[PDB]
């Protein structure tokens, strides 16, 4: 291949970091540890993939260049560029089966694999399209991401539901014990559509949203999603399966309403967790007039007890929770006051910011 380009170090670094995202340690196939480099019509394209998703970055070439393509080891190429001095000019060209990198009197010769062998996601058609601020997408993901399953056999839970309805984009994540849902208006009327983005794709999409001026352009096909932000293009396959319906998970008629400060509640739960069972993480909540008592016991016979003033009137009740589930919600809310809606000791509780209904959290108790 004839491929040649010269580019400033600082135009390469963030592109290289981004496209190396899909790459896991110990790739199954050697070429999956490589980046595809393509020079065409004044643009350098860099692609990384894991066969389920891909990340593409486009870099403008103003200095002399020659078209062509190759694939090089991602981590080694990134480490070389990062290790060069600030402001370095990076001259790249092909020599047989090697890619040569020169800056000053630093020279590197990397092994390559043919660009013709690099895997590509199958062609597909967009059927839903919309743009939204990056901050809006970031908020939608951070508000729910923690509730996704990790490696459940129910593969559709190891991902995030992305749903369009009316003017809003909604994210839903659940692991069967706890659920998180968040809706945000995007100011454009949309068709009703729902897709499941794999966990790993959710993390990638999250990582491409910086503190930037660019909008996020989203395209959804029957089996793929694409997100375009500036000079970055992320594509992922979608997860098959029926995602649970959050509307059916929300507690139907919660007759008990507690309100309390978010940080006061968080710090009390965080201290009580110290003396909770390391495996089961159970804490007990005792609600009585304008008071919440949190207790935690462990197999060493130790006990933590926190008493808080809260706003509550109604029947005294005792309910048990996995304290990590509660702390996850309080950390995600990061608001002033929290509202908890309860029914009884065997039913779920709904937690939300007392001042906003944009996000809702449902946590199932442990038997008391």
């Amino acid at each position: 291949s004839h491929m040649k380009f010269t580019v400033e170090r600082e135009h390469l670094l963030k592109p290289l970091q981004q496209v190396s995202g899909p790459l896991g340690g110990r790739p199954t196939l050697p070429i999956l540890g490589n980046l595809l480099l393509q020079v065409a019509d004044g643009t350098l394209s860099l692609t990384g993939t894991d066969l389920e998703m891909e990340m593409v970055a486009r870099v403008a070439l103003v200095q002399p260049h020659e078209p062509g393509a190759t694939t090089v080891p991602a981590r080694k190429f990134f480490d070389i560029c990062r290790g060069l001095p600030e402001g370095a000019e990076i001259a790249v060209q092909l020599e047989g089966e090697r890619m040569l990198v020169r800056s000053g009197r630093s020279r590197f010769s990397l092994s390559t694999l043919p660009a013709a062998d690099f895997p590509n996601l199958d062609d597909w058609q967009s059927e839903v399209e919309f743009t939204l601020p990056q901050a809006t997408m970031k908020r939608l993901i951070e508000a729910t991401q923690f509730s996704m399953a990790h490696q459940d056999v129910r593969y559709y839970l190891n991902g995030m539901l992305f749903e369009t309805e009316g003017e809003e984009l909604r994210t839903v994540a659940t692991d069967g014990h706890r659920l998180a849902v968040c809706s945000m208006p995007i100011g454009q009327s949309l068709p009703s559509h729902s897709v499941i983005v794999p966990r790993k794709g959710v993390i990638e999409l999250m990582r491409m949203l910086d503190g930037g001026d660019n909008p996020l352009r989203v395209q959804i096909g029957s089996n793929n999603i694409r997100a375009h932000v500036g000079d970055f293009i992320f594509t992922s396959k979608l997860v098959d399966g029926r995602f649970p319906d959050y509307r059916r998970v929300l507690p139907k008629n919660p007759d008990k309403h507690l309100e309390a400060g978010c940080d006061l509640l968080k710090q009390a739960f965080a201290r009580a967790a110290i003396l909770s069972n390391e495996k089961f993480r159970g804490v007990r909540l005792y609600v009585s007039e304008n008071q919440l008592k949190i207790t935690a016991n462990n197999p060493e016979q130790e006990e933590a007890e926190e008493i808080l003033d809260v706003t509550y009137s109604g029947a005294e009740m005792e309910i048990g929770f996995n304290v990590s589930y509660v702390l996850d919600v309080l950390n995600a809310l990061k608001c002033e006051n929290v509202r908890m809606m309860l029914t009884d000791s065997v039913s779920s509780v709904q937690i939300e910011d007392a001042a906003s209904q944009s996000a809702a959290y449902v946590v199932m108790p442990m038997r008391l």
């Binding site: 659940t174 649970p244 059916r248 998970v249 779920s348 199932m364 442990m366």
Partner: peptide
């Protein structure tokens, strides 16, 4: 631990 669904 109880289940949501």
């Amino acid at each position: 631990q109880a289940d949501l669904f």
